[PDB]
Design a protein around this nucleic acid. Structure first.
Ligand SMILES: Nc1ncnc2c1ncn2[C@H]1C[C@H](O)[C@@H](COP(=O)(O)CP(=O)(O)OP(=O)(O)O)O1
Ligand SMILES: [Mn+2]
Ligand SMILES: [Mn+2]
Ligand SMILES: [Mn+2]
Ligand SMILES: [Mn+2]
Ligand code: NA
Length: 313
DNA sequence: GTCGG
DNA sequence: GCTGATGCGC
DNA sequence: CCGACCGCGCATCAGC
């Protein structure tokens, strides 16, 4: 809230570069700037003050100067008013509609939610589900509901087999008071880096009607929809489940706890210490080093350990 | 769009 | 009917 | 001043 007007501005520019310009590196540049400014403990008075921060450069400092002077950004004003930009931006809020589908739709005059309904036969399964739950998927999930969801998943998992271990990661594990979705990391002793495990868990969650819909499902990843049992229905929620080798659990939990900016910052700092981190391993790239805890990974790269609650960048 | 090389 | 190409979310 | 900034699992379909 300290520099919220600035970070909101940079976030809206990011979304434009992602959805309309299809410029993913600019999208990420804007987000890294919004992130670093969010962390800045002073109220920003000038573009030059902001330019001191790593990731804020010449062009953002200028935009910051204009925002500070006028209270707005002319570039954003023009985008908002541009029918094609505005429509593409909008359509990409449907899960399953990305920059390419959005732009194709808009070129054919499909431009609003109603139009998508009028044309559901042009949508694939994922997009039809995105449309069906459009409002629900933009609602946040209160931590109290996440706690009930956790209990359902952790118990139904234990029903299928007691050696399974499910861990809710993402913003929940970082202790956020609300979450955009539910991210679940799954392990079983029989699946290691050598050695239907996911399908058994998915189908049970379907059996007790927690999982309502499927977006994508394979041997190691499930993307779908779930809903707490009900009164007014609870909203339908996005749920992601990943099955990962048990001996790669801690790299996995580190990664899927995030945040995504934190992961970016860690993989870059890793390189600055001779290491390379991914979702599965940490390597000097040579053999995967041994890991028994998240802190093991912090140690290797000489960072002070950070509890999950301190990785929300 | 930014920054280290 | 198959599959390389690519989109999507992450 | 110029390139790196992750790369992958899963679904779809244009082009044979
Ligand atoms: N592009 C990316 N680069 C690096 N790491 C990435 C990533 N996308 C996702 N991740 C990682 C970190 C997230 O915390 C985690 C879950 O990704 P997520 O898409 O569920 C976002 P989350 O952090 O859970 O907040 P929320 O909005 O859902 O409440 O997976
Ligand atoms: Mn999440
Ligand atoms: Mn989300
Ligand atoms: Mn997720
Ligand atoms: Mn990857
Ligand atoms: Na979308």
């Amino acid at each position: 809230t300290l520099n919220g007007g600035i970070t909101d501005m940079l976030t809206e520019l990011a979304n434009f570069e992602k959805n309309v310009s299809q410029a993913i590196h600019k999208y990420n540049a804007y987000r890294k700037a919004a992130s670093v400014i969010a962390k800045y403990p002073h109220k920003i008075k000038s573009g030059a003050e902001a330019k001191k921060l790593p990731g804020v450069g010449t062009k953002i400092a200028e935009k910051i100067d204009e925002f500070l002077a006028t209270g707005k950004l002319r570039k954003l004003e023009k985008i908002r008013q541009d029918d094609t930009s505005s429509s593409i931006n909008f359509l990409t809020r449907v899960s399953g509609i990305g920059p390419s589908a959005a732009r194709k739709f808009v070129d054919e005059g499909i431009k609003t939610l109603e139009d998508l309904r009028k044309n559901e036969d042009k949508l694939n399964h994922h997009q039809r589900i995105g449309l069906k739950y459009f409002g629900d998927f933009e609602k946040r999930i209160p931590r109290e509901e996440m706690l009930q969801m956790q209990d359902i998943v952790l118990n139904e998992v234990k029903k299928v087999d007691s050696e399974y271990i499910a861990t809710v990661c993402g913003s929940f594990r970082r202790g956020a008071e609300s979450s955009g979705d539910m991210d679940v990391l799954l392990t079983h002793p029989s699946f290691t880096s050598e050695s239907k495990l996911l399908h058994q868990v998915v189908e049970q969650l379907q059996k007790v009607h927690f999982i309502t819909d499927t977006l994508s499902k394979g041997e190691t990843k499930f993307m779908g929809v779930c809903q707490l049992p009900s009164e007014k229905e609870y909203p339908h929620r996005r749920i992601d489940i990943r099955l990962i080798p048990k001996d790669q659990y801690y790299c996995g939990v580190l990664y899927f706890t995030g945040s995504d900016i934190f992961n970016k910052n860690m993989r870059a700092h890793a390189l600055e210490k001779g290491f390379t981190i991914n979702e599965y391993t940490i390597r000097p790239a040579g053999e995967p080093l041994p890991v028994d805890s998240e802190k093991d990974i912090f140690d290797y790269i000489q960072w002070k350990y950070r509890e999950p609650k301190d990785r929300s960048e």
